[PDB]
Amino acid sequence: DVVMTQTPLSLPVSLGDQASISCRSSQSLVYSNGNTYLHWYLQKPGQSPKVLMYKVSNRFSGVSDRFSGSGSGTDFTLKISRVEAEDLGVYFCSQSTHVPLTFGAGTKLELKRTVAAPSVFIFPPSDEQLKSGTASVVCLLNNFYPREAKVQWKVDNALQSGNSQESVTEQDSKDSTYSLSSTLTLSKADYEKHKVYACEVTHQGLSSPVTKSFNRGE
Amino acid sequence: EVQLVESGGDLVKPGGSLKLSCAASRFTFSNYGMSWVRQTPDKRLEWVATISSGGRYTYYPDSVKGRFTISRDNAKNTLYLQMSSLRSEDTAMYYCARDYLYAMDYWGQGTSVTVSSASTKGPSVFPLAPGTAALGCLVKDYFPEPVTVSWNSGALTSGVHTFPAVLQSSGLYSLSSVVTVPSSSTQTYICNVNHKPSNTKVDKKV
């Protein structure tokens, strides 16, 4: 099968600036009639893909003229001339010259913005959940940028390891920020064995790591 | 204003069968080829099947050839995908798409298919109890995906963040949905959780 390799896979860009995406095929996309059946799609957050371009350079009806396609043979480029917030998403190239039709892995366009520190909240487990024998403690990091952050759990000032999972939202089109949840899961017995529960957050927007905590009994 | 609406996704046991349907609207369905494409949990896309406008030709990749069968009813403006001998690697979001000229221009919002020997399990919803305050709902120990979460029956959308599900060590999924609100708010906050595969729908006051 034809392998489609896209570059970059992560594309941070500022609003109004230019961006370009590379797509390279593992074999020539020239068909026996001399035409080239290389197409591009955009998947916006929470949506299914929509087509942008067909046969290298042809815009589908309704696609902004800020998008242009070029290339030949095995080497193709998608260009965005002035990026808009609605361009946020994953761009896919695809070939139909050779069956099976194949897609590249996708390139995620990301909007740059000023650094924004997270708003950190911590939630104890509910009494209903404690009845079931399990304790989930949740640390929320809200509306921050860039996406990179470190979240460390501490129980009675003692660092935790291996008992937490993180989840991050896709970039919000409205303000270009991320939110993150970290969930600490403990047995009910282990939870009621300790008093202080804390999550320590490291982020470029915080000059020192900050800790948010609660006391189980208080 | 072309529209495609998929249905039929579900949890299916390995070796089982499942039929997806796609209802087409606002175009002359009979004049276009139609396709199915799936998106696996790693976000990669894989073309699944294509059928010509009049049903004369069908096309498949080796991964599903023989096992999957695409068909269409031009009188009823409907596309079908019959899946058989289902494997774990067939787990994916399945999209119906219209072939327009040389590519697939419009795609439905998709229907979810999970192939697993594990049984269905509905979520346990727990509150995340709260001048900006945060509150939410922890939706944990459900299988399979998906779960949809709204707030106050769809009236509260500003400041809502519903996180991607994470797979727990137990093989069950878990996610939280949070919302930031003014700390001054008397106001009743209810998270509406729907889990179609287990026929679970619960509303939890926080």
Binding site: Y31, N33, S96 | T50, I51, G54, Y59, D99, L101, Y102
Partner: peptide
């Protein structure tokens, strides 16, 4: 005239 994205490559049923 049968139409789909693969038939279209022959540039006849367009």
């Amino acid at each position: 005239c049968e139409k789909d994205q693969f038939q279209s490559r022959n540039e006849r049923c367009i």
